[PDB]
Amino acid sequence: APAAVDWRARGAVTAVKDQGQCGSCWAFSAIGNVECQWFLAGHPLTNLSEQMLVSCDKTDSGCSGGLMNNAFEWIVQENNGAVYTEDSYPYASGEGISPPCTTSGHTVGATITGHVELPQDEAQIAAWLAVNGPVAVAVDASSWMTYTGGVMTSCVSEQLDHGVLLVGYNDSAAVPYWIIKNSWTTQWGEEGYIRIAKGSNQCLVKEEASSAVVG
Numbered sequence: 001a002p003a004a005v006d007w008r009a010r011g012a013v014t015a016v017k018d019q020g021q022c023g024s025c026w027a028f029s030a031i032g033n034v035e036c037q038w039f040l041a042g043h044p045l046t047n048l049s050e051q052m053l054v055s056c057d058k059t060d061s062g063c064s065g066g067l068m069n070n071a072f073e074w075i076v077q078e079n080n081g082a083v084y085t086e087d088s089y090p091y092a093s094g095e096g097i098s099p100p101c102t103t104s105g106h107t108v109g110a111t112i113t114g115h116v117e118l119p120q121d122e123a124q125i126a127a128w129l130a131v132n133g134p135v136a137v138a139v140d141a142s143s144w145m146t147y148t149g150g151v152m153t154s155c156v157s158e159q160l161d162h163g164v165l166l167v168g169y170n171d172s173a174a175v176p177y178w179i180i181k182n183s184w185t186t187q188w189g190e191e192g193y194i195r196i197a198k199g200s201n202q203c204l205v206k207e208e209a210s211s212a213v214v215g
């Protein structure tokens with residue numbers, strides 16, 4: 001794989017979003033992955049709807065949490081592969097109240113046919129990302145509440161409790177790192193991103209990696 005990749009440089013990543021006081025990170029991880037894949041599949045970059053998942057995916061638990069892998073199955077199995085646009089199903093859960101699902105009236109912004117779950121191997125995740133684009137990952141984010149910048153190297157790595165998006169890596173750096181998009185606005189971290197060391201399973205980053213398949 002190349003020494004360094006950053007899918008932001010390809011224009012493939014939407015702006016950093018704001019989940020607010022809702023435990024909807026899993027939705028932001030899944031939808032951000034879809035946004036990137038939809039762009040890479042030859043379409044304009046389009047903001048897509050987290051609220052569709054938070055309100056309508058009853059396999060997951062709204063503001064109480066969820067899993068990207070379940071979200072991807074819901075999209076395909078329950079929603080005909082459709083992911084609505086942000087504008088047509090906008091984010092309403094920032095104050096912690098998810099509105100009831102509505103099935104009528106939204107605009108499809110992307111279509112997926114499935115998703116992949118990657119091996120629990122940072123090298124193989126990086127090699128897949130280098131070719132195919134950003135990867136949704138579960139992490140232990142419990143050490144992230146003081147991060148102001150730099151490469152984090154000794155994160156608590158004990159329990160998956162958050163979902164985020166790998167957008168790149170740098171193996172050349174003095175401490176090799178992953179580049180991760182969060183959903184805590186651009187006012188946290190490095191304009192909304194965190195670098196964690198790569199190669200030591202920091203934050204349990206290799207354990208639950210996946211990506212949508214556009215089709």
Ligand SMILES: *C(#N)C1=NC([N]C2=[C]C(F)=[C]C(F)=[C]2)=C2N=[C]N([C][C])C2=N1
Nearest residue numbers: 023024025026064065138160161162163
């Ligand atoms: C977010 N925000 C969030 N996530 C989880 N759990 C989670 C998310 C994920 F993407 C992958 C995982 F393995 C685990 C939450 N569990 C509780 N809460 C607060 C309601 C969570 N928020």
